């Protein structure tokens, strides 16, 4: 699922720091679930 | 760590020495931990820990 957002972002943006900033944040996300 | 200390201190040395090489190999590309950002400014840190053991073993020298 969030693979595919990735993904999904990807595509937009060729239609990355952005992109580091963005797995730094479903990390986080991950970090909270496991908390 | 978790189970016991002391002669585990050679051993982190050990292990410090395989994770720099290990690092050596995979030079541009980034490894996450999780049980997440453990790359290269925690091995500096893991490197504090040697130095810190390395101090720890000088004194333990100039006591006997």
Same mark, same amino acid.
């Given at each position: 699922? %969030? $693979?595919? $957002?990735?993904?999904?972002?990807? !595509?937009?943006?060729? %239609?990355?720091?952005?992109?580091? =900033?963005?797995?730094?944040? $479903?990390?986080?996300? =991950? !970090?909270?679930?496991?908390? | &760590?978790?189970? &016991?200390? +002391? &002669?585990?201190? *050679?051993? *982190? ?6 994770? +720099?090489?290990?690092?050596? +190999? /995979? &030079?541009?590309?980034?490894?996450? /931990?999780?049980?997440? *950002?453990?790359? /290269? ?17 000088? +004194? ?5």
């Amino acid at each position: 699922g %969030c $693979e595919l $957002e990735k993904l999904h972002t990807k !595509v937009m943006s060729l %239609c990355y720091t952005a992109k580091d =900033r963005l797995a730094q944040s $479903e990390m986080a996300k =991950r !970090v909270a679930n496991i908390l | &760590r978790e189970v &016991r200390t +002391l &002669r585990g201190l *050679q051993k *982190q040395v050990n292990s410090y020495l395989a994770c +720099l090489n290990c690092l050596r +190999l /995979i &030079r541009p590309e980034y490894a996450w /931990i999780v049980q997440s *950002q453990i790359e /290269i400014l925690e091995l500096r840190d893991l490197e504090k820990e040697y130095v810190l053991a390395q101090t720890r073993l000088t +004194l333990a020298k100039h006591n006997p």
